[PDB]
Amino acid sequence: VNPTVFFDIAVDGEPLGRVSFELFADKVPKTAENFRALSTGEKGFGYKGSCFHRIIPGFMCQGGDFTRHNGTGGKSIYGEKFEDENFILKHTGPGILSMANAGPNTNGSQFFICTAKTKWLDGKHVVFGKVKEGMNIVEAMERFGSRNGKTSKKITIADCGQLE
Amino acid sequence: MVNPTVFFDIAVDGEPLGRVSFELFADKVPKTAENFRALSTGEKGFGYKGSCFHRIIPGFMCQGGDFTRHNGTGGKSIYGEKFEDENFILKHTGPGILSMANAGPNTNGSQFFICTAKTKWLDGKHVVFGKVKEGMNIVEAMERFGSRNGKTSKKITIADCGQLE
């Protein structure tokens, strides 16, 4: 069974609700595992308490920089970076979960949640999951963003883990 | 004052391809222009000379400027690791626009991209600061080496760079 993970989202510290994700371990096991383990915190580091530092309405919500909280950091469970596993899956619509990067084979911890189909990213960012529940939470988050990604309230992962 | 101009001499696996020159819009984005200019002269003791275009996405852009890690994970400005977005006055109007790479608000460093098309979706998200003056043919030649994740089939380097008179 593909694992399920959740983020409990807060807005200026006040709980908004839960976003749940299916991770496509059946297609991208290494990429899924990274995200899974970062969500449980089981390596001693990960997404709990981190923020969505770049929210761009009509595009996506980006987060996962748990070391510098601004897009300059993050690390994977394998090292600073790891290779693009495959590009089997496409950015088909809202809810798609995909890895942020700045070049080939530079996956770390940063990720984004699409709020639209983002076809031009196909073959460039590794898709590895999708929102299962709480897309309404992601749509709510998206309203706090701007063209450059600056948010108007602090959007945090107050808690996260694996559902089972 | 006429805006400053800089040049890159581009090589392919070390073999000279040609030169790309750029106007830097110091009249609109002086801080961002100055960064790119200084990184191109090497006057601070670091900069673009010897670096590579590590992400060439044909039909979109040629991205480079990571002279510390050579892969997108590094770079630094002349102001420190990062500097704030100066302004978003200028738009991604067509081929040859120079714009700053970023991973979030206020994260400009040294990485940049040369657009090979009008990229209107980037407006307000990346700071535009210059444009190719001569050598767009060279930029199109560079795109022959790219692919969809930006991986290049040969190493595309800034063999030399500097400021023109």
3-state secondary structure of B117: coil
C-beta atoms of B150 and A103 within 8 A: yes
Question: Which residues does chain B have within 8 Å of residue A56's beta carbon, measured at their own beta carbons?
Answer: 125
Q: In what order do the strands lie in the sheet with B61-64?
A: B55-57, B61-64, B112-115, B97-100, B128-134, B15-24, B5-12, B156-163
CATH node for B1-165: 2.40.100.10
**How much is the CA Rg of chain B, to the nearest whole Å?**
14
Rounded to an integer, what distance in angstroms lies between the CA atom of residue B39 and that of residue B47? 4
Say how far apart CA B103 and CA B29 lie, in whole Å: 20
- CA gap A53, B135 in Å, rounded: 37
- Distance (Å) of CA B72 to CA A16, A17, A110, A118: 34, 34, 14, 21
Experimentally determined by: X-ray
Q: Return d(Cα B20, Cα B9) in angstroms, integer.
A: 7
CA angle A89, A92, A95 (to 5 degrees): 100
Q: Which residues contact A87 (CB under 8 A, 6 or more apart)?
A: A122, A123, A126, A127, B148, B149
Beta strands at A4-11 and B15-24: parallel, antiparallel or unpaired: unpaired
Which residues in chain B have Cβ-Cβ distances shorter than 8 Å to A65? 103-104
Resolution (A): 1.4
Chain A residue whose CA is closest to B86: A148
d(CA B83, CA B74): 14
* A102–B104 CB contact, under 8 Å: no
Phi-psi region of B38 (alpha: psi -120 to 50; beta: other; left: phi over 0): alpha
Phi-psi region of B17 (alpha: psi -120 to 50; beta: other; left: phi over 0): alpha
Give residue B72's Cα distance to chain centre: 13
| Whole-number Å distance between alpha carbons of A93 and A117 | 4
In chain A, which residue's Cα lies nearest the Cα of B57?
A: A124
| 3-class secondary-structure state, position A129 | strand
The answer to whether the CB of A54 falls within 8 A of the CB of A152 is no
Active site residue A68: no
Burial class (CB in 10 A: 0-12, 13-18, 19+), A59: buried
How far are the Cα atoms of A91, A97, A108, B47, B83 from residue A81, in angstroms, in the given order?
Answer: 22, 18, 5, 24, 24
Decide: helix, strand or coil at residue B35: helix
Q: Domain spans of chain A?
A: 1-164
A vs B, Cβ pairs < 8 A, gives 82
CB atoms within 10 A of CB A43: 12
Question: Taking CA atoms, what residue in A is nearest to B60?
Answer: A120
Cα of B154 to nearest chain A Cα, Å: 14
Q: What angle do CA B45, B48, B52 make, to 5 degrees?
A: 140
B95: distance to nearest CA of chain A, Å?
Answer: 18
Rounded distance between C-alpha atoms, residue A66 and residue A75, angstroms: 8
Residue in B57, B73, B106 closest to A124 by CB: B57
Exposure string over B18-50, b if 16+ CB within 10 A, otherwise e: bbbebbbbbebbebbbbbbbbbbebeeebbbbe
CA distance B129 to B99: 6
Q: How far apart are CA B89 and CA B128, in angstroms?
A: 8
- Using a 10 angstrom Cβ sphere, with 0-12 exposed, 13-18 middle and 19 or more buried, the burial of residue A137 is buried
In angstroms, the CA A107 to CA A91 distance is 17
10 Å Cβ neighbour count for B2?
7
Which strand (E) or helix (H) includes residue A34? helix A29-40
- Name which CATH class applies to A1-164: mainly beta
